[PDB]
Ligand binder design. Structure first.
Ligand SMILES: CCCN(CCC)C(=O)c1cc(C)cc(C(=O)N[C@@H](Cc2cc(F)cc(F)c2)[C@H](O)[C@H]2C[C@@H](OCC)CCN2)c1
Length: 390
């Protein structure tokens, strides 16, 4: 592991997001910032909000520059409105550099901030194409690379605890690592396998095959990427296109049929509980997603366990049962490989080589009988046809 200063710099959990400490302005104002590979705007609360105990105070920064322009950013979940400007930004547990970056000062928001998440802003790590108002607003990572010698690559190790973290525990617990400019080998086991970034907007990838316990879901692979497939740390769940979700749920139900779960569970809205330590992991299937490889006609697969797709939640009675929510849900905007999937792997966003790497995470949750996996190669033909074209 060669990036010790950045190892263990994240906090949070899948249900509320993973965040990194950043500083903005002069003198530096410390803020916790949501790591979001599914958007491209750097934005921080800049006005009082019931869920914020701190916010960016522009009038206290000698390096603040007003762009005299408003900005509106709508996400699937919620939205915010703000005022554009630039200021000096640093990451305390990151690369020892300070850069001048665009910052949207959030003045109004709806369903954006999360009560108790401990974060006050968002770091959109995707490409300028999807930046608001338009692609001329340079994203933070682009500025970082242009202004310093930091390699055009970052990697994420999101660490799910495998159990509920109460308010105090989640504040004192290490939630993972964001390695800026490199790959830290202590964070994964086995080999890194790379899939091409199909196009530089979201971190778009192509899924070529899906298995539930080794059984082919057997759908036209274009359905898996309808209308796109993305890697998104800013979404909790694995979200699947309607038809794929329906097929996957039918197959996961069939594999786990020795126990019947209520419809509310499969809808991802209701928790299920087991007596302490008795969660029947073995009745739930593993899920394998095959991704386009970098070699012609070659693919590889990433395999996740129910310890990834069943999200630990506190029992509404706070008892001693082990409880979970089903973290796979339906999408109308393509596949979203969210945080619960990322928790099984060390994910390398190799922007310089236009590829995303996956390796088994050194912090993934598993049992004595099964482990997450990244395996290859597999002969796979006509993978280009798996991509969707509007
Ligand atoms: C992560 C904590 C729990 N959480 C948010 C609160 C329930 C989710 O799991 C979640 C669920 C859905 C269905 C969408 C998004 C979502 O829109 N996430 C965005 C980031 C985000 C927004 C927000 F407003 C609160 C928050 F924390 C995180 C991504 O940028 C997402 C936006 C999407 O916008 C398309 C218009 C494109 C893909 N990436 C996030």
């Amino acid at each position: 592991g060669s990036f010790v200063e950045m190892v263990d710099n994240l906090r949070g959990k899948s249900g509320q997001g993973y965040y990194v400490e950043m500083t903005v302005g002069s003198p530096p104002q410390t803020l916790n910032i949501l790591v979001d590979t599914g958007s491209s705007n750097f934005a921080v609360g800049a006005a009082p909000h019931p869920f914020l105990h701190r916010y960016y105070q522009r009038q206290l920064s000698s390096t603040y520059r007003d762009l005299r322009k408003g900005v509106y950013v709508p996400y699937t979940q919620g939205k915010w409105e703000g005022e554009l400007g630039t200021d000096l930004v640093s990451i305390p547990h990151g690369p020892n550099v300070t850069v001048r970056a665009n910052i949207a000062a959030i003045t109004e928001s709806d369903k954006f901030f999360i009560n108790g998440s401990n974060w006050e802003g968002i770091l959109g790590l995707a490409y300028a194409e999807i930046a608001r108002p338009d692609d001329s607003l340079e994203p933070f990572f682009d500025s970082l690379v242009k202004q310093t010698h930091v390699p055009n690559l970052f990697s994420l190790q999101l660490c799910g605890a495998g159990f509920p973290l109460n308010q105090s525990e989640v504040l004192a617990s290490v939630g993972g690592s964001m390695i800026i400019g490199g790959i830290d080998h202590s964070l994964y086991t086995g080999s890194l396998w790379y899939t091409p970034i199909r196009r530089e907007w979201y971190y778009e990838v192509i899924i070529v095959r899906v298995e539930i316990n080794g059984q082919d879901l057997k759908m036209d692979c274009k359905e898996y990427n309808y209308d796109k497939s993305i890697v998104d740390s800013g979404t909790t769940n694995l979200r699947l296109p309607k038809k794929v979700f329906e097929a996957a749920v039918k197959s996961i139900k069939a594999a786990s049929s020795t126990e019947k779960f209520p419809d509310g569970f499969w809808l991802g809205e209701q928790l299920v509980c087991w007596q302490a330590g008795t969660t029947p992991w073995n009745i739930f299937p593993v899920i394998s997603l095959y991704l386009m490889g970098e070699v012609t006609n070659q693919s590889f697969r990433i395999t996740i366990l129910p310890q990834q797709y069943l999200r630990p939640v506190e029992d509404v009675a706070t008892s001693q049962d082990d409880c979970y929510k089903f973290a796979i849900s339906q999408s109308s905007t393509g596949t979203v490989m969210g945080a619960v999937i990322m928790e099984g792997f060390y994910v390398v966003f190799d922007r310089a080589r236009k590829r995303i790497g996956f390796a088994v995470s050194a912090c993934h949750v598993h049992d004595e009988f099964r482990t997450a996996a990244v395996e290859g190669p597999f002969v796979t033909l006509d993978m280009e046809d798996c991509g969707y074209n509007i």
